[PDB]
Structure formats: structure tokens, C-alpha cells
Write a protein that binds this ligand. Sequence first.
Ligand SMILES: NC(=O)c1ccc[n+]([C@@H]2O[C@H](COP(=O)([O-])OP(=O)(O)OC[C@H]3O[C@@H](n4cnc5c(N)ncnc54)[C@H](OP(=O)(O)O)[C@@H]3O)[C@@H](O)[C@H]2O)c1
Ligand SMILES: CN(Cc1cnc2nc(N)nc(N)c2n1)c1ccc(C(=O)N[C@@H](CCC(=O)O)C(=O)O)cc1
Ligand SMILES: [Mn+2]
Length: 159
Amino acid sequence: MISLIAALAVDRVIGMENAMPWNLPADLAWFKRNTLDKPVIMGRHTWESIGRPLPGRKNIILSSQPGTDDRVTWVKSVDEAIAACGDVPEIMVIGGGRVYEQFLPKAQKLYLTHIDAEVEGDTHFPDYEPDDWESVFSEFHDADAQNSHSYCFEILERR
Ligand SMILES: NC(=O)c1ccc[n+]([C@@H]2O[C@H](COP(=O)([O-])OP(=O)(O)OC[C@H]3O[C@@H](n4cnc5c(N)ncnc54)[C@H](OP(=O)(O)O)[C@@H]3O)[C@@H](O)[C@H]2O)c1
Ligand SMILES: CN(Cc1cnc2nc(N)nc(N)c2n1)c1ccc(C(=O)N[C@@H](CCC(=O)O)C(=O)O)cc1
Ligand SMILES: [Mn+2]
């Protein structure tokens, strides 16, 4: 099954100039918890902003261009990306915007982190139809010493 995993600030902003403005260590924690030991799909920019392979995960990168690093797996299409994953129970799509736009309709579950933060971004999460989805998990957190804003973890399943 395909799942989208993402972190959103105010107004579905997800990035700015190839990066994430805020710093929310609890989000990284949770991102890692959720993707560890599973395959992660990500676009070329996102990989670039990551600058390295994520351990304990099969890294799959989508580019129309040929690979330039054997540490990860390169693919040139959404189909191939998914085939490259093999037979596993869950595929984690991690970004960025274009990639999410493409996998949304094929996805059965959303892992969203709602961040209480106002940032001028240049990239946004897709506009998805709430009707279609169901909140199965929700947990709120106030900002703290490690985390500068309040946030909320959420899991939704397509009805
Ligand atoms: N907050 C979040 O959770 C989160 C998670 C990830 C990323 N982000 C942010 O997202 C922004 C980067 O997002 P982005 O939309 O600019 O880039 P992206 O989605 O990561 O990368 C886009 C690219 O991936 C390739 N690609 C995508 N679909 C393809 C397909 N069907 N076939 C072949 N290649 C395909 C293309 O590479 P080629 O040009 O080489 O073909 C295209 O340039 C950054 O700001 C990052 O910080 C946020
Ligand atoms: C660029 N970026 C993409 C990124 C970041 N936060 C997100 N947060 C959420 N919720 N969802 C995403 N898709 C997301 N994607 C990154 C950057 C660094 C690491 C990273 O180091 N991850 C460690 C986290 C633990 C550590 O901080 O050492 C891991 O192993 O998963 C991951 C994603
Ligand atoms: Mn149902």
C-alpha cells in the first residue's frame, strides 16, 4: 500500500527554497519511526536537500536523469518507482511537492504533521479532498524547549 508522509505548516506550505524552514526535532523522530525499515520514494530535489542516503531504508529517487550515486536506487517513472519497491506491505512517499502530487491518488494513507508556524514557502502540499479521508489517529503537542512550535501528528486513511 502506498502512504504519503509529510510535514505541513500554515497554509499547506512545505518548503522554501529547497529546505524546511522550521526545526522540529519531534517531527524527525516521528518521520524516522514511520519510515524505518521500509522503502522511501522521493523526488530529485528532495534527495538533494537530504544530501545522503537514509539508513535502514531503501532509498528510491525519481529523476528523468540518470543516477549519479550507487548508494541509492534511481527510477524514471512512478510505475517503475513502485515496482522497484518490491512486495512490501507499505511504501513511503516522502516528498517533495511534485512527487506528492503524483502519488496522492494512488495512496491509501496519510501521515501528516500539522505545524503551527507561519512561513512564506514556495512549495505546498496538494489540495486534497477531506471527504475522502478518515482521521484515525491524532495527537497534539505544545511547543517546548526542543520544539519551537506546537504541532500535531495525524493519520488518515482513505475511506
Ligand atoms: N515538509 C515536508 O515534509 C517535505 C518533505 C520533502 C520535501 N519538502 C520540500 O520540497 C521542496 C522540493 O520539492 P519539489 O517539488 O521542488 O521537488 P521534488 O518533488 O522532491 O523533486 C522534483 C523532481 O523529481 C523528479 N521527478 C518527479 N516526478 C517524476 C516522474 N514521474 N518521472 C521522473 N522524474 C520525476 C524530477 O527530477 P528531474 O528534474 O531530475 O526529472 C523533478 O525535478 C523543498 O523545499 C523540500 O524542502 C518538504
Ligand atoms: C530533507 N528532509 C525531508 C523531510 C523532513 N522532515 C519530514 N517530516 C515529515 N513528517 N515528513 C516528511 N516527508 C519529511 N521529509 C529530511 C532531512 C533529514 C532527515 C533525516 O536525518 N532523517 C533521520 C531522522 C533522525 C535524526 O535526526 O538523526 C532519519 O533517519 O529518518 C530526513 C528528512
Ligand atoms: Mn472504507
